[PDB]
PDB file of C-alpha atoms and ligand atoms in Angstrom:
ATOM      1  CA  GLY S  26     199.873 185.042   4.585  1.00 23.06           C
ATOM      2  CA  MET S  27     202.200 183.196   6.983  1.00 24.88           C
ATOM      3  CA  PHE S  28     203.670 181.213   4.056  1.00 22.87           C
ATOM      4  CA  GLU S  29     206.700 182.095   1.808  1.00 22.65           C
ATOM      5  CA  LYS S  30     206.278 182.963  -1.789  1.00 19.91           C
ATOM      6  CA  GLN S  31     208.057 180.854  -4.344  1.00 20.53           C
ATOM      7  CA  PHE S  32     208.848 182.651  -7.514  1.00 21.53           C
ATOM      8  CA  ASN S  33     208.277 180.582 -10.602  1.00 18.58           C
ATOM      9  CA  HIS S  34     208.810 181.187 -14.287  1.00 17.68           C
ATOM     10  CA  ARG S  35     207.923 179.641 -17.649  1.00 17.04           C
ATOM     11  CA  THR S  36     208.336 181.104 -21.120  1.00 20.87           C
ATOM     12  CA  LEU S  37     205.116 180.788 -23.279  1.00 21.91           C
ATOM     13  CA  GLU S  38     205.369 180.888 -27.003  1.00 22.60           C
ATOM     14  CA  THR S  39     202.755 182.731 -28.892  1.00 21.86           C
ATOM     15  CA  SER S  40     201.934 184.240 -32.261  1.00 20.88           C
ATOM     16  CA  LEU S  41     203.301 187.491 -30.849  1.00 19.63           C
ATOM     17  CA  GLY S  42     205.468 185.676 -28.277  1.00 19.47           C
ATOM     18  CA  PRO S  43     207.453 184.657 -26.465  1.00 19.14           C
ATOM     19  CA  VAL S  44     205.773 185.811 -23.216  1.00 17.57           C
ATOM     20  CA  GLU S  45     207.380 185.459 -19.774  1.00 15.88           C
ATOM     21  CA  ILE S  46     204.970 184.067 -17.318  1.00 16.92           C
ATOM     22  CA  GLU S  47     206.291 184.524 -13.830  1.00 19.70           C
ATOM     23  CA  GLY S  48     205.552 185.330 -10.237  1.00 21.31           C
ATOM     24  CA  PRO S  49     204.744 186.224  -7.467  1.00 22.88           C
ATOM     25  CA  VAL S  50     206.458 189.515  -8.425  1.00 20.77           C
ATOM     26  CA  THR S  51     207.521 191.907  -5.695  1.00 24.27           C
ATOM     27  CA  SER S  52     206.063 195.376  -5.465  1.00 24.86           C
ATOM     28  CA  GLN S  53     209.410 197.047  -6.060  1.00 22.03           C
ATOM     29  CA  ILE S  54     209.867 195.111  -9.508  1.00 22.86           C
ATOM     30  CA  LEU S  55     206.118 195.613 -10.532  1.00 24.36           C
ATOM     31  CA  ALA S  56     206.413 199.365 -10.205  1.00 24.52           C
ATOM     32  CA  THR S  57     209.199 199.327 -12.970  1.00 26.04           C
ATOM     33  CA  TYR S  58     207.031 197.638 -15.458  1.00 26.75           C
ATOM     34  CA  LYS S  59     204.239 199.164 -17.633  1.00 29.91           C
ATOM     35  CA  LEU S  60     200.618 197.762 -17.796  1.00 31.32           C
ATOM     36  CA  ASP S  61     199.585 197.260 -21.427  1.00 28.98           C
ATOM     37  CA  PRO S  62     196.988 199.934 -22.521  1.00 27.71           C
ATOM     38  CA  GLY S  63     194.487 197.160 -23.284  1.00 25.86           C
ATOM     39  CA  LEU S  64     193.999 195.959 -19.599  1.00 27.94           C
ATOM     40  CA  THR S  65     191.059 198.366 -18.635  1.00 29.74           C
ATOM     41  CA  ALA S  66     188.342 195.841 -17.702  1.00 29.84           C
ATOM     42  CA  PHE S  67     188.397 196.814 -14.108  1.00 26.89           C
ATOM     43  CA  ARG S  68     189.947 200.374 -14.288  1.00 24.91           C
ATOM     44  CA  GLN S  69     192.215 202.555 -16.363  1.00 23.37           C
ATOM     45  CA  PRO S  70     195.752 201.142 -16.623  1.00 24.63           C
ATOM     46  CA  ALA S  71     197.618 203.758 -14.376  1.00 24.64           C
ATOM     47  CA  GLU S  72     195.114 203.065 -11.648  1.00 24.81           C
ATOM     48  CA  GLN S  73     195.053 199.262 -12.175  1.00 25.15           C
ATOM     49  CA  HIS S  74     198.969 199.174 -12.082  1.00 23.47           C
ATOM     50  CA  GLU S  75     198.884 200.887  -8.680  1.00 23.82           C
ATOM     51  CA  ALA S  76     196.329 198.279  -7.696  1.00 25.96           C
ATOM     52  CA  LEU S  77     198.687 195.390  -8.609  1.00 20.79           C
ATOM     53  CA  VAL S  78     201.794 196.943  -6.916  1.00 20.05           C
ATOM     54  CA  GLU S  79     199.618 197.315  -3.664  1.00 18.75           C
ATOM     55  CA  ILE S  80     198.431 193.789  -3.791  1.00 22.48           C
ATOM     56  CA  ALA S  81     201.965 192.545  -4.337  1.00 24.30           C
ATOM     57  CA  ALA S  82     202.859 194.508  -1.082  1.00 23.28           C
ATOM     58  CA  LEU S  83     200.313 192.545   1.017  1.00 24.68           C
ATOM     59  CA  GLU S  84     201.597 189.788   3.424  1.00 22.42           C
ATOM     60  CA  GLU S  85     199.460 187.213   1.513  1.00 22.75           C
ATOM     61  CA  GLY S  86     199.352 188.973  -1.834  1.00 20.75           C
ATOM     62  CA  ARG S  87     200.520 187.424  -5.065  1.00 18.01           C
ATOM     63  CA  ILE S  88     200.778 188.931  -8.529  1.00 14.45           C
ATOM     64  CA  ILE S  89     201.683 186.622 -11.298  1.00  9.76           C
ATOM     65  CA  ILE S  90     202.288 188.404 -14.744  1.00 10.40           C
ATOM     66  CA  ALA S  91     202.442 187.673 -18.472  1.00 10.16           C
ATOM     67  CA  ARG S  92     205.164 189.893 -19.672  1.00 11.88           C
ATOM     68  CA  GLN S  93     207.159 191.080 -22.814  1.00 13.88           C
ATOM     69  CA  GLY S  94     209.996 193.132 -21.878  1.00 15.40           C
ATOM     70  CA  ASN S  95     208.839 195.877 -19.401  1.00 15.78           C
ATOM     71  CA  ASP S  96     205.272 195.424 -20.695  1.00 17.89           C
ATOM     72  CA  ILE S  97     202.700 193.538 -18.678  1.00 16.78           C
ATOM     73  CA  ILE S  98     200.140 192.069 -21.216  1.00 18.91           C
ATOM     74  CA  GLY S  99     198.332 189.985 -18.651  1.00 18.68           C
ATOM     75  CA  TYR S 100     198.198 189.148 -14.873  1.00 19.80           C
ATOM     76  CA  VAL S 101     196.453 187.177 -12.251  1.00 18.31           C
ATOM     77  CA  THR S 102     196.023 188.312  -8.626  1.00 17.01           C
ATOM     78  CA  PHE S 103     195.762 186.635  -5.272  1.00 15.75           C
ATOM     79  CA  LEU S 104     194.831 188.119  -1.908  1.00 14.36           C
ATOM     80  CA  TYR S 105     192.506 187.637   1.070  1.00 13.57           C
ATOM     81  CA  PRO S 106     188.855 188.193   0.267  1.00 12.38           C
ATOM     82  CA  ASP S 107     187.419 191.847   0.505  1.00 12.27           C
ATOM     83  CA  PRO S 108     186.365 192.821   4.022  1.00 13.21           C
ATOM     84  CA  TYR S 109     183.039 194.248   2.568  1.00 13.87           C
ATOM     85  CA  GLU S 110     182.181 191.245   0.609  1.00 14.83           C
ATOM     86  CA  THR S 111     180.687 187.969   2.105  1.00 11.31           C
ATOM     87  CA  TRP S 112     183.716 185.808   1.301  1.00 13.11           C
ATOM     88  CA  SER S 113     185.822 187.395   4.041  1.00 12.95           C
ATOM     89  CA  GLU S 114     183.507 186.488   6.988  1.00 13.95           C
ATOM     90  CA  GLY S 115     184.905 184.729   9.962  1.00 16.62           C
ATOM     91  CA  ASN S 116     188.543 184.188  11.114  1.00 18.25           C
ATOM     92  CA  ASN S 117     189.823 181.740   8.405  1.00 19.59           C
ATOM     93  CA  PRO S 118     193.332 182.554   7.062  1.00 15.07           C
ATOM     94  CA  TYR S 119     193.159 179.383   4.707  1.00 15.14           C
ATOM     95  CA  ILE S 120     190.714 181.105   2.458  1.00 14.78           C
ATOM     96  CA  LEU S 121     192.364 183.084  -0.366  1.00 14.41           C
ATOM     97  CA  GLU S 122     190.782 184.876  -3.218  1.00 14.89           C
ATOM     98  CA  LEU S 123     191.954 184.784  -6.807  1.00 14.98           C
ATOM     99  CA  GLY S 124     190.955 188.434  -7.298  1.00 14.73           C
ATOM    100  CA  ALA S 125     191.183 188.798 -10.975  1.00 16.01           C
ATOM    101  CA  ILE S 126     192.840 187.646 -14.176  1.00 15.80           C
ATOM    102  CA  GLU S 127     193.127 189.739 -17.223  1.00 15.57           C
ATOM    103  CA  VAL S 128     194.927 189.572 -20.564  1.00 16.23           C
ATOM    104  CA  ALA S 129     195.142 192.117 -23.498  1.00 17.15           C
ATOM    105  CA  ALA S 130     192.648 191.379 -26.196  1.00 16.26           C
ATOM    106  CA  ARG S 131     195.269 190.880 -29.030  1.00 14.54           C
ATOM    107  CA  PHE S 132     196.811 188.121 -26.923  1.00 13.60           C
ATOM    108  CA  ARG S 133     193.460 186.156 -26.564  1.00 15.64           C
ATOM    109  CA  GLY S 134     193.519 182.586 -27.826  1.00 17.24           C
ATOM    110  CA  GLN S 135     197.122 182.014 -27.027  1.00 15.07           C
ATOM    111  CA  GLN S 136     196.361 180.242 -23.800  1.00 18.36           C
ATOM    112  CA  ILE S 137     198.027 182.867 -21.433  1.00 17.02           C
ATOM    113  CA  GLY S 138     195.252 182.526 -18.858  1.00 16.14           C
ATOM    114  CA  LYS S 139     195.892 178.731 -18.544  1.00 16.13           C
ATOM    115  CA  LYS S 140     199.695 179.357 -18.063  1.00 15.95           C
ATOM    116  CA  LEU S 141     199.091 182.271 -15.775  1.00 14.38           C
ATOM    117  CA  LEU S 142     197.203 179.831 -13.593  1.00 12.36           C
ATOM    118  CA  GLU S 143     199.793 176.986 -14.027  1.00 11.92           C
ATOM    119  CA  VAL S 144     202.617 179.106 -12.764  1.00 14.97           C
ATOM    120  CA  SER S 145     200.512 180.377  -9.966  1.00 15.19           C
ATOM    121  CA  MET S 146     199.953 176.784  -8.692  1.00 16.73           C
ATOM    122  CA  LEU S 147     203.650 175.811  -9.006  1.00 14.50           C
ATOM    123  CA  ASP S 148     204.112 176.985  -5.448  1.00 15.08           C
ATOM    124  CA  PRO S 149     203.437 174.026  -3.108  1.00 18.67           C
ATOM    125  CA  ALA S 150     202.150 176.724  -0.741  1.00 17.83           C
ATOM    126  CA  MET S 151     198.910 177.054  -2.746  1.00 18.04           C
ATOM    127  CA  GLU S 152     197.854 173.603  -1.644  1.00 17.77           C
ATOM    128  CA  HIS S 153     197.404 174.905   1.788  1.00 16.06           C
ATOM    129  CA  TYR S 154     194.629 177.333   0.681  1.00 15.21           C
ATOM    130  CA  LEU S 155     191.106 177.107  -0.478  1.00 11.82           C
ATOM    131  CA  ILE S 156     191.218 179.520  -3.415  1.00 16.09           C
ATOM    132  CA  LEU S 157     187.799 180.905  -4.386  1.00 13.23           C
ATOM    133  CA  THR S 158     186.972 183.378  -7.119  1.00 12.98           C
ATOM    134  CA  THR S 159     183.995 185.354  -8.410  1.00 10.49           C
ATOM    135  CA  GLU S 160     183.377 186.331 -12.005  1.00  8.50           C
ATOM    136  CA  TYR S 161     180.484 188.659 -13.092  1.00  8.14           C
ATOM    137  CA  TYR S 162     179.265 189.323 -16.543  1.00  8.87           C
ATOM    138  CA  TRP S 163     179.696 193.156 -16.155  1.00  7.13           C
ATOM    139  CA  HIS S 164     183.544 192.998 -16.102  1.00  6.85           C
ATOM    140  CA  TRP S 165     183.898 190.841 -19.306  1.00  5.95           C
ATOM    141  CA  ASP S 166     185.145 192.277 -22.566  1.00  7.02           C
ATOM    142  CA  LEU S 167     182.434 190.632 -24.692  1.00  5.90           C
ATOM    143  CA  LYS S 168     182.447 193.498 -27.379  1.00  6.49           C
ATOM    144  CA  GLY S 169     186.192 193.093 -27.875  1.00  6.16           C
ATOM    145  CA  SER S 170     186.260 189.266 -27.628  1.00  7.29           C
ATOM    146  CA  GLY S 171     183.198 188.998 -30.008  1.00  8.08           C
ATOM    147  CA  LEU S 172     181.750 186.326 -27.695  1.00  5.82           C
ATOM    148  CA  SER S 173     178.166 186.088 -26.447  1.00  2.00           C
ATOM    149  CA  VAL S 174     177.863 185.820 -22.652  1.00  2.00           C
ATOM    150  CA  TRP S 175     177.349 182.048 -22.514  1.00  2.59           C
ATOM    151  CA  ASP S 176     180.234 181.263 -24.812  1.00  2.00           C
ATOM    152  CA  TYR S 177     182.362 183.523 -22.761  1.00  2.20           C
ATOM    153  CA  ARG S 178     181.256 181.767 -19.562  1.00  2.00           C
ATOM    154  CA  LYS S 179     182.059 178.318 -20.983  1.00  2.00           C
ATOM    155  CA  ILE S 180     185.516 179.423 -22.080  1.00  2.00           C
ATOM    156  CA  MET S 181     186.224 181.309 -19.004  1.00  2.00           C
ATOM    157  CA  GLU S 182     185.195 178.295 -16.805  1.00  2.76           C
ATOM    158  CA  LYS S 183     187.355 175.713 -18.662  1.00  7.22           C
ATOM    159  CA  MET S 184     190.222 178.202 -18.313  1.00  2.90           C
ATOM    160  CA  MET S 185     189.716 178.321 -14.508  1.00  4.49           C
ATOM    161  CA  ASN S 186     189.333 174.506 -14.476  1.00  4.67           C
ATOM    162  CA  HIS S 187     192.883 174.126 -15.746  1.00  9.45           C
ATOM    163  CA  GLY S 188     194.035 176.134 -12.653  1.00 11.11           C
ATOM    164  CA  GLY S 189     192.030 173.612 -10.460  1.00 12.17           C
ATOM    165  CA  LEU S 190     188.980 175.866  -9.763  1.00 12.21           C
ATOM    166  CA  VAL S 191     185.579 174.349  -9.998  1.00  9.34           C
ATOM    167  CA  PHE S 192     182.099 175.873 -10.094  1.00 11.42           C
ATOM    168  CA  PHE S 193     180.186 175.934  -6.813  1.00 14.59           C
ATOM    169  CA  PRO S 194     176.512 176.840  -6.343  1.00 17.83           C
ATOM    170  CA  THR S 195     175.832 179.726  -4.155  1.00 21.05           C
ATOM    171  CA  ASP S 196     172.911 181.916  -2.740  1.00 20.65           C
ATOM    172  CA  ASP S 197     175.026 185.051  -2.815  1.00 20.24           C
ATOM    173  CA  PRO S 198     172.677 187.745  -4.241  1.00 21.68           C
ATOM    174  CA  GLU S 199     175.095 189.413  -6.538  1.00 23.73           C
ATOM    175  CA  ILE S 200     176.270 186.103  -8.151  1.00 25.65           C
ATOM    176  CA  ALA S 201     172.712 184.681  -8.117  1.00 28.00           C
ATOM    177  CA  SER S 202     171.363 187.745  -9.899  1.00 28.84           C
ATOM    178  CA  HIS S 203     172.489 186.274 -13.283  1.00 30.27           C
ATOM    179  CA  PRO S 204     173.109 182.598 -14.221  1.00 34.13           C
ATOM    180  CA  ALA S 205     176.172 183.571 -16.205  1.00 32.22           C
ATOM    181  CA  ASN S 206     177.904 184.858 -13.084  1.00 34.56           C
ATOM    182  CA  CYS S 207     179.634 182.193 -10.939  1.00 35.39           C
ATOM    183  CA  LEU S 208     181.640 181.283  -7.899  1.00 36.07           C
ATOM    184  CA  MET S 209     184.454 178.952  -8.420  1.00 34.89           C
ATOM    185  CA  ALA S 210     187.028 177.521  -6.024  1.00 33.51           C
ATOM    186  CA  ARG S 211     190.146 175.296  -5.786  1.00 32.88           C
ATOM    187  CA  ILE S 212     190.420 173.225  -2.697  1.00 34.68           C
ATOM    188  CA  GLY S 213     194.095 172.586  -2.074  1.00 31.88           C
ATOM    189  CA  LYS S 214     195.128 168.978  -1.385  1.00 30.17           C
ATOM    190  CA  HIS S 215     196.190 169.908   2.253  1.00 29.91           C
ATOM    191  CA  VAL S 216     193.129 172.030   3.143  1.00 30.93           C
ATOM    192  CA  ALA S 217     191.373 170.891   6.246  1.00 30.29           C
ATOM    193  CA  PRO S 218     187.664 169.883   6.266  1.00 27.43           C
ATOM    194  CA  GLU S 219     187.006 172.783   8.681  1.00 28.91           C
ATOM    195  CA  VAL S 220     188.088 175.303   6.047  1.00 29.16           C
ATOM    196  CA  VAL S 221     185.897 173.692   3.502  1.00 29.96           C
ATOM    197  CA  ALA S 222     182.907 173.679   5.866  1.00 30.96           C
ATOM    198  CA  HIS S 223     183.525 177.359   6.428  1.00 35.68           C
ATOM    199  CA  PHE S 224     183.489 177.903   2.643  1.00 35.88           C
ATOM    200  CA  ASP S 225     180.240 176.024   2.251  1.00 34.34           C
ATOM    201  CA  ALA S 226     178.762 178.242   5.005  1.00 31.65           C
ATOM    202  CA  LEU S 227     179.797 181.335   3.190  1.00 26.88           C
ATOM    203  CA  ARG S 228     178.421 180.393  -0.304  1.00 30.12           C
ATOM    204  CA  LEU S 229     175.188 178.879   1.121  1.00 28.05           C
ATOM    205  CA  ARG S 230     174.786 181.868   3.491  1.00 25.40           C
ATOM    206  CA  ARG S 231     171.074 181.689   4.189  1.00 27.78           C
ATOM    207  CA  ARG S 232     171.184 178.094   5.619  1.00 27.33           C
ATOM    208  CA  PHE S 233     169.924 179.559   8.918  1.00 26.14           C
ATOM    209  CA  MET S 234     166.390 180.013   7.320  1.00 24.60           C
ATOM    210  CA  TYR S 235     166.305 176.189   7.100  1.00 24.38           C
ATOM    211  CA  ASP S 236     168.106 175.194  10.275  1.00 20.55           C
TER     212      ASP S 236
HETATM  213 CA1   CA U  28     188.169 186.223   7.196  1.00 21.44          CA
HETATM  214 CA1   CA U  29     186.978 188.202  -9.562  1.00 20.29          CA
END
């Protein structure tokens, strides 16, 4: 939150491209764009657009977008973990959540996710955060992607790996409920051991049973 947001930009060529990959984008500017109709994995586009704008308005919030003209065909979000999920416990401002990352189905296979993550990490400020993320099978567009759950998981994980995120075991009930779900996290080069220890305490939450 206390850090400044460095705007970065790269043009990604695609079979439909080129696509402008840039951010963090301000709320004022995000409101002028239009979410592509095919970005409905979390909620309908009108509601999800309002959600991206709101996130951008947060002190720590960052919205990086994949864009063609006024049309957002993909995005990736960053903000502090949800107050009503386990990842927000304690007073640790060095823990940031990669909320979500979504890309219109027709743009799949053009490595937009990879770049979306690249441009997100171009800001040296990201090295000061431990960036965790959660992925659940029930938000994945398997029907549209044609992928089984495990092929999807393998592809999605390697995408996240390109952004520096790595899989971490957890005893979190929701994630643990299905092996395909996962917690991943990117530990910035400048992140202190205390922050990492806190993260370990969050993901292995029932340690007290064994203390
Ligand atoms: Ca907290
Ligand atoms: Ca997520």
